[PDB]
Amino acid sequence: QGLGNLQPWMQGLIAVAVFLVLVAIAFAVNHFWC
Amino acid sequence: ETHELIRNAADISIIVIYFVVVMAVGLWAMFSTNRGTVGGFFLAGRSMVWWPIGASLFASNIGSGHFVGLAGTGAASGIAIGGFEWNALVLVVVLGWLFVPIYIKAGVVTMPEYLRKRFGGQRIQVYLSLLSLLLYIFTKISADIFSGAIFINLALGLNLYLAIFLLLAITALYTITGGLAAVIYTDTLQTVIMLVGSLILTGFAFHEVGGYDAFMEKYMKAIPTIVSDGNTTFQEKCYTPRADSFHIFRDPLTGDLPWPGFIFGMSILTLWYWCTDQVIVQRCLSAKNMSHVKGGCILCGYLKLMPMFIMVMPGMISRILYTEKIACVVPSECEKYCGTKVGCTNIAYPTLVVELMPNGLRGLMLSVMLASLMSSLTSIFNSASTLFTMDIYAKVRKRASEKELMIAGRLFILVLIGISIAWVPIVQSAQSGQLFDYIQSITSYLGPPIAAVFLLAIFWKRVNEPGAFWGLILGLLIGISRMITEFAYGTGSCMEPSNCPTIICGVHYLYFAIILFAISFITIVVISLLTKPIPDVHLYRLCWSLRNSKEERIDLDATEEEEKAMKMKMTDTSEKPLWRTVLNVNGIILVTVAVFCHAYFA
DSSP states (O other), X not given: OOBTTBOHHHHHHHXXXXXXXXXXXXXXXXHHTO | OTTSGGGSSHHHHXXXXXXXXXXXXXXXXXXXXXXXXXXXXXXXXXXXXXXXXXXXXXXXXXXXXXXXXXXXXXXXXXXXXXXXXXXHXXXXXXXXXXXXXXXXXXXXXXXXXXXXXXXXXXXXXXXXXXXXXHHIIIIIHHHHHXXXXXXXXXXXXXXXXXXXXXXXXXXXXXXXXXXXXXXXXXXXXXXXXXXXXXXHHHHHHHHHTTSHHHHHHHHTXXXXXXXXXXXXXXXXXSSSOOTTTTOSSBOSSSSSSBHHHHHHHHXXXXXXXXXXXXXXXXHHHTBSSHHHHHHHHHHHXXXXXXXXXXXXXXXXXXXXXXXXXXXXXXXXXXXXXXXXXXXXXXXHHHHHHHHHSOHHHHHHHHHHHHHHHHHHHHHHHHHHHHHIIIIIIHHHOTTOOHHHHHHHHHHHHHHHHHHHHHHHHHHHHSOOTTHHHHHHHHHHHHHHHHHHHHHXXXXXXXXXXXXXXXXXXXXXXXXXXXHXXXXXXXXXXXXXXXXXXXXXXXXXXXXXXXXXXXXXXHHHHHHHHHSOOOOGGGGTTTSTTTSSOOSOOOOTTOOHHHHHHHHHHHTOOOOOHHHHHHHHHHHHHHHHHHHHHHHHHO
């Protein structure tokens, strides 16, 4: 389950960070435009 | 013999106790439904709690097809299949937040009814009802019955005829005249039993394989001793484990379930399965409020993370312990052990069940497998009855009373029960070593057009009945063309590669699903833009633009105060502030967990 030098659980952490940023960005965009 | 281990004692006791409990809950819920009116029978009265909705959403999807196919196919190529379940949760969240609010706000018992209301023609509803019923009767009934047969012949000694007959009778006693209230109240027990017994099995299997790390290492060297004999030896790819086994996202073309087709096509036909398919939505529309559907759908997604660790992983463990049985390639040995000449890969779960666990645990666990099958068959039967009564029977008699519709639904449940015993000869006799490939191909040909028509009937305003009809017809024609051309020539064996041309057979069925989605989408849009539109007056509360609008609606299919208030409440889709906040937060948490799991394995 290793890609590059990345640990299997670090993918989870990075993906969660990206998804949370996207949720916050989408919420902010929705608030600004609605 | 492998079919006599369950004969001892506690096996019989646990299965009979399970049957007694499920029948008892079904009957108790049968007398808690207010049957006799369509609102209370097919929609359970719009009084279901949140967590039974979630439980039913899980147990209607998860059947014997899942256990058998996931474990066996996991013995073929690793974690590749697990992501089905994982895509489910995202889309169920999407459903709960976007699709159910409109359907509740439209007062639509059936999805074809919603399409008629938005478009305004009888042919759309009739065609969708017939196509959805055919998809039911073929794909889902085949999955359930075949997998029933597989784990019955391997684990029990019961002939398919008697076993399927008995399962259908047990189901029939409460499904025929139970409606969604009985369905869900009996389904929560199915879900609980499945989760408990299957957690026990997965823990036992992981302990006996020596843990997850040793599981990984041992699995990759589970190569069957025999690779010779008969006419010829085999190409070192029909038996060796795959190097991309433990990754969900595989090569775009070289590997089975390539990641582009994986994510995109899987989402495309999962929008059909969850958001547009009748079986799952009825569970959401039978709710007590609008927050209860969101509670149910979050719970469904949360314990839809479980399936992989309970079906895919045990299959691998089945291969590691009994590699000679679940990895045979030689036709002689394969035909020897379980059945089909090519296969024996489909018996991974039932061999792991009948062997790994102790006597009582084997009994309870076999009853888990039965629990899986009954829920799905109940769901499909009730939803087929609703579709028939609401569209076809309704349009064959426009003056029908409620009682006549109820009796029509029940008779349709009876006939569709009989169709399953009519189905068992085909499933037993036919060479079904590649059955699940065919089931997924069938669902990957006729699904994407319906997914497109509904995603445009909701997230759009200009589409109209000509566009929807002709896009659906075109998509059907393309799907039937490919399906016939792939079945006539037949899908290729490992030793004997595919016969048919690369244009049709070379494309993975998920790639063709996405292509057909795009073609149906384009065709619907073009034909719709050629014909005059439907004014917004008829589309209030039926499209995502107009759901909040509270003006009077001219329906395209066109005490008093207490009845009006009851109707408005049934169409009411507003929850309290704090409950709405908690439901949004926990939904976000669910999608976060899914993203983490996707990233962890893939």
